[PDB]
Every structure is written in structure tokens, then in C-alpha cells.
RNA sequence: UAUACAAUUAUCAUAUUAAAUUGUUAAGUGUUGAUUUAACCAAUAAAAAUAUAAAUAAUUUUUAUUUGUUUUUAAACACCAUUAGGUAUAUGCAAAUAUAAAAUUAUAGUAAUUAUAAAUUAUAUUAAAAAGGUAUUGUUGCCCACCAAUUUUUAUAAUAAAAAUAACGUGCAGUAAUUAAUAUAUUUAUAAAAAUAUAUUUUUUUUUUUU
């Protein structure tokens, strides 16, 4: 037919029972929304909700990758500019435009280089959207609570060592110099929690 | 009162306050000195300093030291912050690998383009375009070209930028190198 | 027109689809094509039909007598896929079938990981790609 | 070894060093133990200044290595004897010498399951390598291997 | 512990709610707990459990005629010897004796 | 090569128990070893009560050598009155094991 | 030996000694202390024998 | 008024096959003074780094044992109060989320329910692109305690407790909400609550594979 199977006449075609009770979800995903823009949840580019996602958290650093416009950004010509700066600082009796010529050559090339890198990077955005991005559909991996289950596995271990007792328990922090300020008969180092 | 060396109030200058330890020559800092650099003759110490500082900053040591040396934080917030840092790292790594796996494809398409240039103009011609000395009659020409390459390859000292430290009001983070808000 | 996309997938998206000149596999492909046109089947369903269709006993172990990594040659596939569109009445002007099926492949040849596809975006599904980024699409 | 010590000592007049070492040695014999090797080293410059019993920080110190065979009961006594002596700045103790770190991890030992007698026979020097050791000992080792394995039985079955 | 961790059921959310309590609910019950505890502090509650006595039944010392806060309500009837001893306990709990372990003090403990 | 037999088990557990006991005498709080001592004592109780129905004189001389009679004492009057102390050697399967004829003429 | 990282032959001593890479001072040296703090910065100078020069 | 839980995966208080426990190290003086802080005030400042193996699995420990409260400041930091101090971290006592359960509240007679998460909410320096709502035409949105009357049940603690409730007066506690919230602990108090000690995201993220 003339358009997508996941999108009917009035908006996104409502499959699950959540869509029938909440059918704002069909026609509005945000302020970057158009009607052709339903079912493709990502909107155009340079546009609101255009950002691709990686394991659910959106990719907002793209330029920083190819080293265009970043603090860590790749610099094309250094040796030139340093050489020329040295020339300027040394003396005023002789003026070297030879250095400024090597440099302006370098720059003249740099322009085209950069346009190339930018173009290749936009191709990367396209590829990343096709073959990698989940389009914001999977749970965040990037903050510690998302990994809670992992930490649980560790707490469990420290519990089975303790005879399956103290869960989430840790040793009492003692003092800066607990070991040498305490008399014979008192614990000088922090014990296992079950051992208290 | 007694303060540690990385404490705010550590070395005070007041009518009561007096600095602690042997302070010169063989000193209080004897085996406590994290870095040592013999200054190379005719080298400004500004390159030395910016090298040290770039090093510390990129490996996130100055981060750590600034962080822990200002305020106390419970072992839970320390864990939360460090593991958050490390998981954000993990995520961005898995992004970098994707980028790179693409850029090797781009680089391939480039090398392929270069091959097509080869069989349009012939291999030797392309080599000529790339600076092959086929015009070098005698060794003196060769030594001119290689003297050029020598004067390129010699590395002028890199002055690597160190992000300034931002002093905010009550200092929620003294790791602050930018004005962005952070989750404490 | 989506037909050409489907056929592109059957030709280029499948490692070792048997010998595609043989009347058996050929008839499989023919029937499925006529069923993608006239909307009787989903593209996804017809594709999974094609790759799961019955070919020959001990298929893999006969495949070890021809292929190393299980990737056959793609000529038989394209010649059959053009043949089917010609013998079925798919286009008013005969050449168009072959041209489009050819052209759409040639354009994809330049793409990174060209003959693999994410399974969700490969065919019709609830969520889709924008018409520029669709795979064998005319708009790429 | 069964036990070892590194003893950082104050650099005194030789008669004093000799008295102190005689005291530690006699403290080991009385307690019914043996000395595999008492190794002397020079007066070195450490990375940390040590204070002595005079609370005067020291730039130089004499290093001395002990290697002992004791019971673990009565080395408590020798421990607080050594650490309480006035000519010893510091003493670090290695008890790990019988089961060091590199053995008995997921059947790393071929043809035996934790043979304890391998590392007991040895001295500390060959369990923990010193920095000067180079590929050269790989030579010497085997001339001391093969040679040994030739003369052992014949030497033993003599008497 | 003797006292109650919670008051009412603080974890009520739908099944598989992946936390013990929601913010909303826990805030409600934090309110109720707050009110009860504040009541305990201002009325100056004191309880006791004595050895060789039924334990579940705790003598309420904050209602004892000597330690009673109200000037009006009839307090409670507890044995003369036992009540003297309770009064002495409450009194000599108050201040830190050196060599003894430091224990938390408050206005409302007196 | 006997290990698992009752007499052996009882003895080794008796020893382990003494060791842990004097250990706890020295350094008061490690409750890990309190727990391990209690578990060891329980498995010792099992081993001994199986012994007296296997061969009782060895049982006796173990109790007299290592001085463990304190873990053979029935825990509390309640469960004893219901005959669940004697009910153990039923579960162990030694209840009929006597082989009378050497002792106690069955007639 | 074939697989070893360790150089076989006479080995350079400067690659062993602890104090090889380290400062070498002189009775005449001045030690300048530049301490940067968060809201402050200051400088001092010291004789090698530890005596303070200027405040 | 009687009239049919689950048993494959269910978060607050009935634990249970476990290897620990014990280590005496560091740090300190030259001299005339604006350190810390968004801002006040007291007023010497430096510091306390080492241990694996081994312990066998189950069958009668449930009145036993056990879950961050700890002598010594003539030692500090830290915290609390304010020029006059307190305190400064597992030898007494102390079961307790890691789930065995039958619609919410409520000491197990009170009201008729409650709780809940992905729709929607314009500004976080890319060669413009990442973001939250207890509201529901949505911040001029909702809500929170004390402070009066009354209604009703009772296990009557300064002035009983609990539930209905639509005044008056304080404020502004909560919705990442004007020092983020949540739970436990201890202290504090016109009232929401606030300070500190731990855990934690039902808070918003910012990302060195030996430099
Ligand atoms: Mg958005
Ligand atoms: Mg003081
Ligand atoms: Mg509280
Ligand atoms: Mg329970
Ligand atoms: Mg104290
Ligand atoms: Mg009433
Ligand atoms: Mg009331
Ligand atoms: Mg507010
Ligand atoms: Mg608040
Ligand atoms: Mg707030
Ligand atoms: Mg709270
Ligand atoms: Mg208040
Ligand atoms: Mg509170």
C-alpha cells in the first residue's frame, strides 16, 4: 500500500491495550512531531527528537567524536604555528614570510579536510541510526541503580560468608588512628559486621 | 588545631600559626613527593608545569585529589559517584568502538579511492604525486628532501591546555572545571 | 514497487539460498513474489517463508561440498529474481523490472555492512525508518 | 624458608652491630630454632627517613636479612624481642614463604597436587627474585640443575 | 530491637515495584511516625521491664506518681520497693560518669 | 582408610570442638566461629549418639578422654518428656541394631 | 631465555639504582615554595639548611 | 447472611553450612605573621598503609548464639553549640527487610477504600539535536502539618489514642520545588520539620583501556 503498516490514517496504529486507554500516545511524542513523523519516532535532523540512542540514552556528542569542535579536538597544524610564533618572538631585524607561507598552505588544505570529516560523520549518524540505535527503546545502562542486580550479587556473597545473615551490612568505620589509640582488650581494627 | 596537608586550613599564616616539619633541603616532603622533573637545559619551566598538569588532569588524579581533599563524603556517595563515573565510561567506550568500527570503513573507502586513482594515472605517476624523488639526479637532492622531512619530524614542544578550576559558592564540587550542573 | 525491495532482499540478504535456477526453489520464489504483490502476505512473512522453504535433505552437508563459509554466488539469484518479475506480469514495460532490481543493489554496494540488516527495520514492523534511510528504497 | 625478616638497623660502630646481631641470634637459639642464612648488606639510603631510639631522624641505615626456622608459637617471643631492640629501626616479616602466591591455583602444578616441600627446601632469594637477576641465571640454573641431579644419589648412598 | 521500625504498612505498592516503598507512601507514614515519636518525647514517656517479672507487661514509669508529668491524672500503682528502685534508676541514668560508655542524652530523658 | 565411620567422626569433631573452644576463650568476639563451634557440636552430638548404638565402650572412653558429656545432655525437659530424645536412634536406624544374644538372653 | 623480557649480558647499573632518577642537591640551593590554594596563593623561599629567607 | 488462595519468578521486620579472629605504625620549628569561609567568631599544626591457603556435603542449635549505639583527648580532624565548653565511632545492652503472604486505613469494631512508572510540560555552548510534574485545557496547578467547634469507636500518657471534618490563624514542608529527596539511627522543636551518622535513587549524565 501507500505507507507504513505501523501507522494508519489517524496516527500510529494502536496495538497494545495501553494505546486504547491512552491514545495521546498515538499522535503526540513531542514538539518535533509531524504526521509523517509518527512511527518514525526520531524526527528529521537538527530537529527536536532527532537524536539517535545507544542502549536508551541519546547520543548528543557527535562532533566531539570526530574531533571537530571539542576541547580534546584534533589539531591539524601545530609545528607550523609554533615555528611561526618562534620567528615572531626572536628578532625584528629579519622578517620571515616563508613561515607564514608554509602555514597558510597548511590552512588552505585544512578547510577541505574538515568538510570531509564532517560529511563522513553525518554518514556515521545515518549508519548508527540504521544498524545500531534502538530509538530510545531499551533501559538506560549508564547509572549505577540500573545495575542494582549486579551489586546485589555481591551483597549476597558477603552475606553467605557471614553465615547468611547481615545483608547490606558493612564494617563500622573506626577512627583515623583507632589501632594505636586503643588499650589492650578492645578491638583495634574493624571486624566483619556479623562478628561485631 | 592539627590539620592534614591537603586540608583547607592546612598551612596557615597568622600570628598564632606556625608551619610544621623541616621545610627546606631534606624536608618534611622527603619521601612524600609525587613528581620530580630535572629541568632540561634551556627549557622554560612552563612546559614542564603544563606537562605535569596535563598528565595529572587526563588521568583524573587532580580530579580525585581536589575531590577528596575538600569535603567529607560518606562511603555511599563516594561509591555512587565512582561507579557512576565508571559506568558512564563503559557506555561511552561502547560508543567509541562503534564510531571507530565505522571510521575504519571510511578509511577503507578512502584507500580504495586511492587505488582507483592508481589505475587511472598508473602507479608510478601516483607515486610522483606523493613526493617520490624520481627527479633526484644525485644524492644532494635526496639530502635536501630528507633535510626537509627531518625539519618536519622534529617535534616542537606541545603546550597542552589545562582546564581552569571553577570556584563556585558553597562548592558542591571542587572538581568543577566547567559551569555545567552536576548530580552530587 | 515495494516488491523490488523484497526481491532485493531475497537476492542479496540470504547466504546460500540453494541453486536458484532449479525449478523447485524457483517456484518457491515465484509464488512468494506473487503473494507479496496483491498484499496476500507480509514482506516479513514471505521472507521467512523463503528462507525456511524446503530445499533438499542434508542441506548443510551438501553445502560443505560447494561452499566454505556458506556464501553462494549471487548471479543465479538476480537472474531468477528478474525472470520471475518478467514471467509474472509485474510491470507494464518489460525492462523496468530488471533495471530496478539491478539499480537498487548497485546503490547499496557502497554502504557499510551492506548485506546485513537489523531484523526489526529490515521489513514491516510497528516502528519504521524515515523514507530516506529505508534500505533498498528509491529515496536513499 | 619457614620465616624471614628484613631488619633495618641503625649504622653504628661495628662492635655494637656485632653485639646486637649476637643478641638476636642467641634469642633465636634459646627459643629452639635455626638460622638458615644471616645475610649482611651495606649502609643504604632508604626512601623514608627513620627515627631511632633518640628520636633523631636518620638518612642512612644498615640492612640485614634474617632467614629462620622456628615454631609459630615461640616466634611471638622472638618477634617482640627483635622489635623491642634499640638498634632495630624497622623489621618486616615474611610468613608467606612456605605457600607463596604463585602456586596451587587451579591445578597449575603438573604431576603433583600442592607439594609443600618444593618451597621449604628453597631460600628466600629464589622464591622472590632480586632486581639484578637477568636472563643469565637461566643459564646457571640449569648447570646447577643437571649437575646436581647427576651427583645426588651417588653422594647420598655413600655413607 | 524493641521499638517498632515502622508504623503501619510502609511497603504497599503494586507487586514487583522495584523498591521497598514509594516516596509518597513513605512520606505519609513518616508523618505518622513523626507525630507518635514527638508525642513520646513531649509527654516524657518512660517504660521499664524488670527481671523476674512478666516481660511483655511493662511497668510504665512515666506515669509513676513521682515522675508523672501531669499534675492531674492518677498515675499508676507500683510496688513501693520496686518504685523506689525505678526512681533511682531513672535518676542515675542521666549523667555521664567517666570510664562508663557514653550514652545519648536529651532534655526529655529527665 | 576409614573416615566416615562413627568412632572416627566423633573423635575428630571432639578435637575440632576443643580447639575452637579455647580459641574463643582467647579472643572473645568472632561470632563466625561461635557459629562454627555450635554446628560442630551438633554434628558431634549426632556422631556420639550413633556410636553408643554401634559400640558403646568406645563411646564411653571417648567421652572420658575428651570430656564431652555436656553435649550429650538432653536439651530441655519438654522435648525429652515426649520421647524425642530417644527418638533420634530411631531415625538413625540403629534402634534394632543391638544383636542381643551376646548380652541379655532374649528368652 | 627465548621468551624472556630480561636482557642477557652485562646490564646497565643506572637502570637499577634507586637514586638514579631523583634530585641531586647542593649546600647552596634555594627552595622556592609556590602553594596554590582555592581562594589564595603564596610563595616562600628556604635555605637548604632549612632557614627561612623572606616571609 | 452461606455460597472453592497460591504452589514457575510476590521487598519491612521468626535469622542458620558458615573462616574468621589477632598485627605499634606515622607525625611533629622556624620565627614576627591577614589563614578558612558566601559571611561571621574562637585560634600551634602535622599525621596512624602488608596476608593467602586450610576448615568437607547433608540429616533434632529456635528457652542457645547473631545483624554498624562503646574505657582512655593528658591525642587530633569532624560534628554541636558560641568569646567560660560538649563531643570526638563495635568488652555490659540491642533478634529482626532480603521476604510464606489472603483488598486500603485502624493496637484486630471507627472511614469505604488505597497504591501505582513509560501520553502531554521550550532555553543545560555539536561540524540547531540529551532531560523532570503529586498537575490532568495542567504552577494564578495541587498538597502539608499544628491552631476551634463538633461526629463516632474504643486498650484513656504533658493536654489520652484513632477516624470523619467545609472554620480561624501561622507559615511554606512536599511535587529533581529556592541548602535534592527517600529509609534507619541520635539530637532538636510554635507548626510543617531541622542538624548530624550511615545506607539509597521511586534525583537530572556527562563519559583517561598504561600519555
Ligand atoms: Mg524531548
Ligand atoms: Mg579543643
Ligand atoms: Mg527521625
Ligand atoms: Mg517473615
Ligand atoms: Mg571516648
Ligand atoms: Mg468519643
Ligand atoms: Mg484525639
Ligand atoms: Mg517548599
Ligand atoms: Mg527539605
Ligand atoms: Mg527541597
Ligand atoms: Mg528524610
Ligand atoms: Mg520546627
Ligand atoms: Mg526526620
- Complete DSSP assignment for D18-45: HHHHHHHHHHHHHTT-EEEEEEEEEEE-
* Secondary-structure breakdown of chain G: helix, strand, coil percentages, each rounded to the nearest 5: 5, 25, 65
Name the A residues in 59-118 with CB < 8 Å from any B CB: 59, 65-66, 71, 78-79, 82-83, 86
Neighbours of D120 (CB within 10 A): 13
Q: Are D59 and D66 in contact (CB under 8 A)?
A: no
The gap between C60 CA and H175 C1' (Å) is 62
Q: Are D102 and D18 in contact (CB under 8 A)?
A: no
* Alpha helices (runs of H) in chain F, residue ranges in sequence order: 6-26, 31-54, 56-66, 77-81, 88-91
Helix (H, G, I), strand (E, B) or coil at A141: coil
Distance from CA of C124 to the nearest CA of A (A): 6
D118: its cell numbers: 618444593
Q: Are A162 and F32 in contact (CB under 8 A)?
A: yes
Compute the distance between CA of residue G7 and CA of residue E85 in angstroms, rounded to an integer: 84
DSSP secondary structure string, chain B?
Answer: ----TTSTTSS--SSS----S--SSS-TTTTT-----PPPTT--HHHHHHHHHHHHHHTTHHHHHHHHHH----HHHHHHHHHHHHHHHHHHHHHHHHHHHHHHHHHHHHHHHHHHHHHHH-HHHHHHHTT--TT--SHHHHHHHHHHHHHHHS-PPP----PPPP--SS-S-TT--SS-----
Cα R_g (chain B), whole angstroms: 27
Cα–Cα distances (Å) from E59 to A129, B127, E42, F107, in that order, read 73, 103, 19, 66
Interchain contact, G1 vs D131, CB within 8 Å:
no
Interchain contact, B24 vs G25, CB within 8 Å:
no
Compute the distance between CA of residue G5 and CA of residue F93 in angstroms, rounded to an integer: 66
Cell 622534529 maps to which residue? B154
The gap between G51 CA and H32 C1' (Å) is 14
Compute the distance between CA of residue F88 and CA of residue F95 in angstroms, rounded to an integer: 9
**CB-contacted nucleotides of strand H (7 Å):** 10-13, 15-38, 42-53, 56-73, 75-78, 87-92, 94-99, 104-107, 114-122, 124-131, 134, 144-146, 156-163, 174-175, 180-189, 191-193, 197-211
DSSP secondary structure string, chain E?
Answer: --S-S-SS-S--SPTT-SSSS-HHHHHHHHHHHHHHHHHHHHTT--EE--TTS-SSS-EEGGGSTTT-S-SSS------HHHHHHHHHHHHHHSSPPBTBPP----GGG-
Compute the distance between CA of residue A194 and CA of residue F36 in angstroms, rounded to an integer: 13
Q: Which DSSP symbol is given to G52?
A: B
Those residues whose C-beta lies under 8 Å from the C-beta of residue E110, and which sit 6 or more positions away, are E94
Interface mutation target, options C127, C132, C134, chain A, most CBs of A under 10 Å: C127
Q: Which DSSP symbol is given to D132?
A: T
Q: Are F49 and F88 in contact (CB under 8 A)?
A: yes
**Contact list, B109 vs chain C (CB under 8 Å):** 110
Distance from CA of G5 to the nearest CA of B (A): 27
Interchain contact, B24 vs G49, CB within 8 Å:
yes
Q: Identify the experimental approach.
A: cryo-EM
B131: its cell numbers: 613526493
C112: its cell numbers: 557499510
Cα–Cα distances (Å) from A89 to A92, A93, F2, in that order, read 8, 11, 93
**Contact list, A164 vs chain F (CB under 8 Å):** none
Compute the distance between CA of residue B105 and CA of residue B102 in angstroms, rounded to an integer: 5
Query: Residue B85: phi, psi to the nearest 5?
Result: -55, -50
C62: its cell numbers: 551438501
Interchain contact, A54 vs B94, CB within 8 Å:
yes
Helix (H, G, I), strand (E, B) or coil at D9: strand
Cα R_g (chain E), whole angstroms: 19
Task: Check CB contact of A16 with chain C, cutoff 8 Å.
Answer: no
Q: How far is CA C23 from the centre of its chain?
A: 17
| Burial of B87 (C-beta count, 10 Å sphere; 0-12/13-18/19+) | middle
First to last CA, chain D: 28
Those residues whose C-beta lies under 8 Å from the C-beta of residue F24, and which sit 6 or more positions away, are F30, F33, F34, F37
Strands, E assignment, A27-142 = 53-54, 57-58
Helix C23-36 vs helix C2-12: crossing angle, to nearest 10: 150
Q: Are C66 and C72 in contact (CB under 8 A)?
A: yes
Chains adjacent to D (≥3 CB pairs closer than 8 angstroms): B, G
Compute the distance between CA of residue C69 and CA of residue C74 in angstroms, rounded to an integer: 14
Helix F6-26 vs helix F56-66: crossing angle, to nearest 10: 20
Q: Are C60 and C16 in contact (CB under 8 A)?
A: no
Amino acid at each position: 500500500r501507500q505507507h507504513d503498516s505501523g501507522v494508519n490514517q489517524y496516527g500510529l496504529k494502536p496495538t497494545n491495550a495501553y494505546d486504547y486507554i491512552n491514545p495521546t500516545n498515538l499522535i503526540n511524542f513531542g514538539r518535533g512531531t509531524t504526521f509523517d513523523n509518527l512511527g518514525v519516532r526520531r524526527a528529521g535532523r537538527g530537529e527536536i527528537d532527532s537524536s539517535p540512542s545507544h542502549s536508551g540514552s541519546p547520543v548528543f556528542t557527535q562532533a566531539k567524536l570526530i574531533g571537530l569542535s571539542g576541547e580534546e579536538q584534533l589539531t591539524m597544524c601545530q609545528s607550523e604555528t609554533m615555528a611561526l610564533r618562534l620567528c615572531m618572538a626572536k628578532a625584528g631585524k629579519e622578517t620571515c614570510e616563508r613561515e607564514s607561507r608554509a602555514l597558510d598552505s597548511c590552512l588552505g588544505r585544512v578547510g577541505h579536510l574538515r568538510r570531509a570529516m564532517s560529511e563522513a560523520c553525518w554518514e556515521f549518524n545515518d549508519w548508527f541510526i540504521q544498524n545500531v540505535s534502538d530509538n530510545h527503546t531499551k533501559p538506560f545502562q549508564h547509572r549505577p541503580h540500573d545495575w542494582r542486580h549486579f551489586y546485589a550479587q555481591e551483597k549476597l556473597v558477603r552475606e553467605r560468608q557471614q553465615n547468611g545473615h547481615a545483608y547490606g551490612r558493612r564494617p563500622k568505620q573506626f577512627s583515623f588512628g583507632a589501632r594505636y589509640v586503643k588499650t589492650d582488650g578492645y578491638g583495634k581494627r574493624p571486624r566483619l559486621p556479623y562478628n561485631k | 588545631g592539627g590539620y592534614m596537608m591537603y586540608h583547607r586550613k592546612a598551612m596557615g599564616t597568622m600570628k598564632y600559626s606556625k608551619w610544621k616539619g623541616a621545610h627546606g633541603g631534606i624536608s618534611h616532603f622527603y619521601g612524600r613527593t609525587p613528581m620530580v622533573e630535572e629541568v632540561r637545559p634551556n627549557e622554560p619551566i612552563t612546559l614542564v608545569d603544563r606537562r605535569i598538569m596535563h598528565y595529572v588532569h587526563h588521568s583524573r588524579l587532580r580530579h580525585f585529589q581536589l575531590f577528596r581533599s575538600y569535603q567529607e563524603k560518606s562511603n555511599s556517595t563516594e561509591c555512587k559517584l565512582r561507579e557512576g563515573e565508571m559506568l558512564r565510561r563503559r557506555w561511552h567506550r561502547r560508543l567509541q568502538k562503534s564510531f571507530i568500527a565505522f571510521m575504519q570503513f571510511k578509511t577503507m573507502k578512502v584507500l580504495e579511492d586511492q587505488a582507483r586513482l592508481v589505475n587511472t594515472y598508473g602507479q608510478a605517476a601516483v607515486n610522483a604525486a606523493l613526493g617520490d624523488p624520481w627527479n633526484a639526479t644525485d644524492n644532494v637532492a635526496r639530502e635536501r628532501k630528507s633535510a626537509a622531512v627531518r625539519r618536519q619530524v622534529r617535534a616542537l614542544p606541545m603546550v597542552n591546555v589545562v582546564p581552569k578550576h571553577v570556584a563556585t559558592m558553597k562548592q558542591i564540587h571542587n572538581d568543577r572545571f566547567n559551569y555545567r550542573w552536576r548530580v552530587n | 514497487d515495494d516488491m523490488f525491495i523484497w526481491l532485493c532482499h531475497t537476492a542479496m540478504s540470504v547466504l546460500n539460498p540453494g541453486d536458484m535456477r532449479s525449478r523447485l526453489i524457483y517456484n518457491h520464489l515465484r509464488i512468494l513474489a506473487e503473494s507479496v504483490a496483491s498484499g496476500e502476505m507480509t514482506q516479513r512473512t514471505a521472507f521467512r517463508f523463503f528462507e525456511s522453504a524446503v530445499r533438499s535433505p542434508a542441506y548443510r552437508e551438501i553445502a560443505k561440498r560447494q561452499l566454505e563459509g556458506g556464501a553462494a554466488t549471487r548471479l543465479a539469484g538476480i537472474s531468477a529474481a528478474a525472470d520471475v518479475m518478467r514471467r509474472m506480469g509485474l510491470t507494464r514495460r518489460p525492462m523496468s523490472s530488471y533495471f530496478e532490481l539491478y539499480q537498487r543493489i548497485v546503490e547499496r554496494s557502497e554502504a557499510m555492512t551492506p548485506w546485513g540488516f537489523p531484523p526489526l527495520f529490515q521489513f514491516e514492523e510497528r516502528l519504521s525508518l524515515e523514507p530516506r534511510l529505508k534500505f533498498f528504497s528509491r529515496a536513499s | 624458608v619457614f620465616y624471614s625478616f628484613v631488619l633495618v638497623m641503625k649504622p653504628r660502630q661495628r662492635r655494637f652491630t656485632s653485639q646486637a646481631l649476637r643478641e638476636i641470634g642467641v634469642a633465636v637459639y634459646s627459643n629452639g630454632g635455626l638460622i638458615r642464612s644471616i645475610t649482611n648488606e651495606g649502609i643504604m639510603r632508604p626512601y623514608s627517613r627513620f627515627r631511632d631510639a633518640d628520636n633523631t631522624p636518620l638518612t642512612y641505615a644498615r640492612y640485614i636479612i634474617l632467614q629462620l626456622d622456628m615454631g609459630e608459637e615461640e616466634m611471638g617471643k622472638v618477634d617482640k624481642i627483635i622489635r623491642e631492640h634499640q638498634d632495630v629501626l624497622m623489621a618486616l616479616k615474611l610468613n608467606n614463604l612456605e605457600r607463596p602466591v604463585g602456586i596451587r591455583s587451579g591445578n597449575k602444578e603438573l604431576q603433583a597436587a600442592y607439594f609443600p616441600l618444593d618451597t621449604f627446601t628453597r631460600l628466600e632469594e629464589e622464591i622472590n627474585w632480586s632486581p639484578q637477576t637477568s636472563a643469565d641465571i637461566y643459564t646457571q640454573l640449569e648447570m646447577n640443575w643437571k649437575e646436581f641431579s647427576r651427583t645426588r644419589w651417588s653422594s647420598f648412598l655413600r655413607n | 530491637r524493641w521499638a517498632a521500625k515502622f508504623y503501619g504498612q510502609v511497603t504497599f505498592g503494586p507487586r514487583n515495584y522495584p523498591y521497598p516503598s514509594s516516596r509518597w507512601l513513605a512520606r505519609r507514614f513518616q508523618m505518622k511516625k513523626h507525630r507518635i515519636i514527638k508525642r513520646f518525647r513531649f509527654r516524657r514517656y518512660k517504660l521499664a521491664a524488670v527481671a523476674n517479672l512478666p516481660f511483655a507487661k511493662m511497668i510504665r514509669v512515666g506515669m509513676l506518681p513521682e515522675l508523672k508529668s501531669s499534675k492531674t491524672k492518677r498515675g499508676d500503682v507500683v510496688d513501693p520497693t520496686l518504685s523506689g528502685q525505678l526512681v533511682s534508676a531513672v535518676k542515675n541514668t542521666g549523667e555521664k560518669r567517666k570510664g562508663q560508655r557514653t550514652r545519648p542524652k536529651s532534655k526529655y530523658q529527665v | 582408610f576409614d573416615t566416615t565411620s562413627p568412632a572416627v567422626l566423633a573423635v575428630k569433631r571432639a578435637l575440632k570442638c576443643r580447639v575452637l573452644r579455647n580459641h574463643l576463650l582467647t579472643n572473645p568476639h568472632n561470632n563466625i566461629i561461635k557459629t562454627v563451634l555450635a554446628n560442630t557440636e551438633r554434628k558431634l552430638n549426632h556422631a556420639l549418639r550413633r556410636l553408643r548404638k554401634v559400640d558403646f565402650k568406645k563411646y564411653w572412653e571417648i567421652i572420658r578422654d575428651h570430656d564431652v558429656q555436656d553435649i550429650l545432655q538432653p536439651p530441655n525437659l519438654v522435648t525429652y518428656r515426649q520421647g524425642s530424645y530417644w527418638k533420634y536412634d530411631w531415625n538413625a536406624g540403629l534402634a534394632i541394631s543391638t544383636n542381643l544374644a551376646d548380652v541379655m538372653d532374649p528368652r | 631465555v627465548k621468551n624472556s623480557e630480561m636482557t642477557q649480558g652485562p646490564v646497565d647499573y643506572s637502570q637499577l639504582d634507586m637514586w638514579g632518577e631523583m634530585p641531586r642537591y647542593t649546600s647552596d640551593m634555594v627552595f622556592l615554595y609556590l602553594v596554590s590554594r582555592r581562594r589564595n596563593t603564596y610563595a616562600v623561599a628556604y635555605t637548604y639548611e632549612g632557614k627561612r629567607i623572606l616571609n
